[PDB]
């Protein structure tokens, strides 16, 4: 299938309390596989998925040095940024970075990603062409002019089209069923009397991977979108996800309601009922 690799970096300044805290995490699709935290006792890239543990000590050692250098670079960026925005040197600011590659079933690069946000707002993004930038404002234009003059996009293309795609392809091979085969949800309906005239029907989807899923209630085959309470998809803490959809129904009318489940792991879309 189609797959993604993404690195997510968060730098948070704390002027007076030392260098900004740098945290990195790496994902393949919805699976986290690495982390680094500048505030750990011995900062190093650590595994967070079983299938990366096989990578040798030079993998871990290279990546650790890259994160330590990136923490220093981000520290410099935050200084430049408070300067560009004419902000106080006393306050805490956030720099987030998100980069990686989307690849199709053939494992060819579909799209490259390389963007930044300052204080939770879009700042600069590499465009789909991977050769030009979109700056959000005049501050971001300073970064843009510098990175154009330095041919930064050209330097970054190499990683997105090369190492990003080849290491993703590697991780996908080594993850095997964990990354390439969808885990279908375990589904059930529960019934929660509110009074003698109303009851809640709750349709559960548990232990599924990846996160993408659709849950809907239907009354006599008609979608009940207006009257469905749908919780945001949430992590189980074991690399799988959960979701539920609930509808309030008149007592004795339960038989009119069906829950409909769409997920990549199911042989076909499921219809469930109170049973």
């Amino acid at each position: 299938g189609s797959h993604s690799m993404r690195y997510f970096y968060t730098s948070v300044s704390r002027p007076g309390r030392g260098e900004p805290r740098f945290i990195s995490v790496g994902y393949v699709d919805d699976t986290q596989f690495v982390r680094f935290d500048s505030d750990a006792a011995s900062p190093r890239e650590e595994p967070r998925a079983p299938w990366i543990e096989q990578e040798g000590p030079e993998y871990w050692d290279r990546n650790t040095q890259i994160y330590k250098a990136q923490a220093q670079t981000d520290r410099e960026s935050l200084r430049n940024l408070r300067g560009y925005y004419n902000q106080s040197e006393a306050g805490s600011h956030t720099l987030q970075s998100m980069y990686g590659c989307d690849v199709g079933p053939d494992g060819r690069l579909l799209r490259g990603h390389d963007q930044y946000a300052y204080d939770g707002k879009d700042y600069i993004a590499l465009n789909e062409d991977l050769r030009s930038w979109t700056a959000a404002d005049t501050a971001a234009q300073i970064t843009q002019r510098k990175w154009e003059a330095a041919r930064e996009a050209e330097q970054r293309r190499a990683y997105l089209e090369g190492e990003c795609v080849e290491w993703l392809r590697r991780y996908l091979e080594n993850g095997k069923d964990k990354l390439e085969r969808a885990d279908p949800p375990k589904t059930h309906v529960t019934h929660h009397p509110i009074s003698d005239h109303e009851a809640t029907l709750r349709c559960w989807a548990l232990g599924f991977y990846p996160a993408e899923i659709t849950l809907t209630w239907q009354r006599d085959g008609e979608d009940q979108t207006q009257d469905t309470e749908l919780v945001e998809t949430r992590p189980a803490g074991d690399r799988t996800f959960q979701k539920w959809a609930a509808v309030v129904v008149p007592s004795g009318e339960e038989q009119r309601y069906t829950c409909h489940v769409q997920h990549e792991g199911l042989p076909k879309p499921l219809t469930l009922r109170w049973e």
């Binding site: 968060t10 945290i23 529960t190 992590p235 539920w244």
Partner: protein, 100 residues
């Protein structure tokens, strides 16, 4: 500077059964900035050794964390998640309900 209020869900990893070991989760998402305080409470008291996921963020740059602890649900014991954030004027307490 963007501020986004955290969304909170409190739930078990598996469907709760009294006297069966489980995981109590507090999922805090959609917040900015990243500075946040999350405590799991048992009968109003802070649970110790509570762990959390590595700080991550969504396509809109909003942060999410899972706070979790091992627990054995019983009939009587009450669990909750207490969240403090710059966007909240009071700490937000969400009670665990095993049907949610």
């Amino acid at each position: 500077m963007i501020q986004r209020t955290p969304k909170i869900q409190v739930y078990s990893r598996h469907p709760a059964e009294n006297g069966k070991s489980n995981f109590l989760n507090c999922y805090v998402s959609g917040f900015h900035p990243s500075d946040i305080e999350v405590d799991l409470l048992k009968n109003g008291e802070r649970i110790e050794k509570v762990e959390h996921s590595d700080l991550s963020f969504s396509k809109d740059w909003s942060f999410y964390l899972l706070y979790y602890t091992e627990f054995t649900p019983t009939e009587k014991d009450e669990y909750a998640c207490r969240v403090n954030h710059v966007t909240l004027s009071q700490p937000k307490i969400v009670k665990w309900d095993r049907d949610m």
